Amino acid sequence: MNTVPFTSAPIEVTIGIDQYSFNVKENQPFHGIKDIPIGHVHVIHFQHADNSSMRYGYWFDCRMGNFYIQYDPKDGLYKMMEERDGAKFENIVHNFKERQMMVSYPKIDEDDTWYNLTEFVQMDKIRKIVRKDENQFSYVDSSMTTVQENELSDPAHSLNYTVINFKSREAIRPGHEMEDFLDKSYYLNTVMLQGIFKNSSNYFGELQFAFLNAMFFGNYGSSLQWHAMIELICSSATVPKHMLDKLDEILYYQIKTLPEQYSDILLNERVWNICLYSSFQKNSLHNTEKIMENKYPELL
């Protein structure tokens, strides 16, 4: 059970840790989050009370170092930093815990929600999508654009999601124009799975990471990437049976976790209607179709 201490909370801010969130008052004696489950990536995230614009946050894994948060009054945000002195860090955390100045990561024992949302997400893959190699943790916010968005403008602050484009030479083999456009199986299985991701676990990890960036930061390019990865599978006649069964589970927990009030902006009508009712896999996503029909029948 690992800890992310905070130096202080000088500005009023809503703090998120994974799917949970807490309101902190300006200069409230808050010194961080304890009992964080080892074995998963986590995201700590922030929305200032005085500017509900720019949700921003840090992906991290406590196995990869000792991380803390400190407010920077110049750049005006909560920053993640690594503490390289193990004995200083253990002594900081022990003091804050003794003074009970930390909130406890509030996991219910029965509750597999976070595991289910991050099953295939690995920090090493996050750090290739979000490039800042001097840090072991990754910064994301509301406004960051994707490599794809930038092509259609500061490359250092980009989300390097795998580019998917159904009307690209990558997607369409010369002489198989109709076959490859109407059945995306070659693009999914040869180009993307065998070629770029190497395995379905990497493909699902990027899909889950795009979803979580869309939900937690309202990052629009992330939402595009999540829909494109779903559509590439649903539009393929030939998908391994284990991939369809696992996709059904992934999407079920994503739709279950989405706030009810954000379904208008975070779900693409065309993609979901096509995936559940017109696509090759219209009958392969039983759990997802049942939760979508019972929770969002207006969208469909």
Binding site: K167, E177, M178, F181
Partner: protein, 237 residues
């Protein structure tokens, strides 16, 4: 984006462009089977690909053999149209290749875009214009070469005959669209108007009769009258 009434003069500028109409590619007669079910029998079709500036028509004849053993033919017809237009472009010298292709039906956009990925500089555009190119098979010489074809064939025509010697490409296109609109609304009446006077013939190397400038004004008037009569009928107004 979309070609409309607003940007009509763009058709007659010096940027090479082609209209593609796929409405006569997949043609069928519907009939009863011995058992009283319904069946289709395909007939020869054609891609109508036209330079509106020059009048140059690339008529690709679609022989019924191309459908043998294929499924979902109305869907395949769009992709075969896209394959054949892409093959035509690649066959033209670089300086003859179009900068734009305008499809008369929006369902041709994705098939043509995917076949032309190798040509990122050629714009594929829809139109809001309701062009009467479906009536191309009412032109006797074009109907004759399609129905006689025993194999896939490309035939080259000038759909304006020698009109451009006397009129601009705007006026020639306006005459063509009026003739095709008449043929589409009432084929028998339109054909009667065009041939009635036996002294005016069609040259062996032409599609339409050899009308003087005055005779074209009379013809154009007779076609407008035909189109308005039919319209009153259609709509009881």
């Amino acid at each position: 984006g979309a070609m409309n009434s607003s940007n009509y003069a763009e058709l007659f500028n010096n940027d090479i462009k082609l209209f593609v109409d796929d409405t006569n590619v997949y043609r069928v007669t519907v009939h009863k089977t011995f058992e009283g079910n319904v069946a289709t029998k395909a007939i020869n079709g054609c891609i109508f690909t036209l330079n509106p500036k020059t009048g140059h028509l690339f008529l690709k004849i679609i022989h019924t053999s191309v459908w043998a053993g294929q499924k979902r033919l109305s869907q395949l017809a769009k992709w075969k149209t896209a394959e054949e237009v892409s093959a035509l472009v690649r066959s033209l010298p670089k300086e003859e290749q179009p900068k734009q292709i305008i499809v008369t039906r929006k369902a041709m956009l994705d098939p043509l875009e995917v076949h032309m990925l190798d040509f990122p500089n050629i714009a594929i555009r829809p139109t809001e214009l309701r062009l009467p190119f479906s009536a191309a098979m009412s032109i006797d010489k074009l109907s004759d070469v399609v129905m006689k074809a025993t194999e896939p064939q490309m035939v080259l025509f000038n759909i304006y005959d020698d009109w451009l010697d006397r009129i601009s490409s705007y006026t020639a296109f306006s005459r063509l669209t009026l003739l095709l609109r008449a043929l589409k609304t009432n084929e028998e009446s339109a054909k009667m108007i065009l041939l009635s006077d036996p002294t005016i013939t069609i040259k062996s190397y032409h599609l339409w009769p050899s009308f003087t400038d005055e005779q074209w004004i009379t013809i154009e008037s007779q076609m407008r009258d035909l189109i308005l009569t039919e319209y009153g009928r259609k709509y009881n107004v």
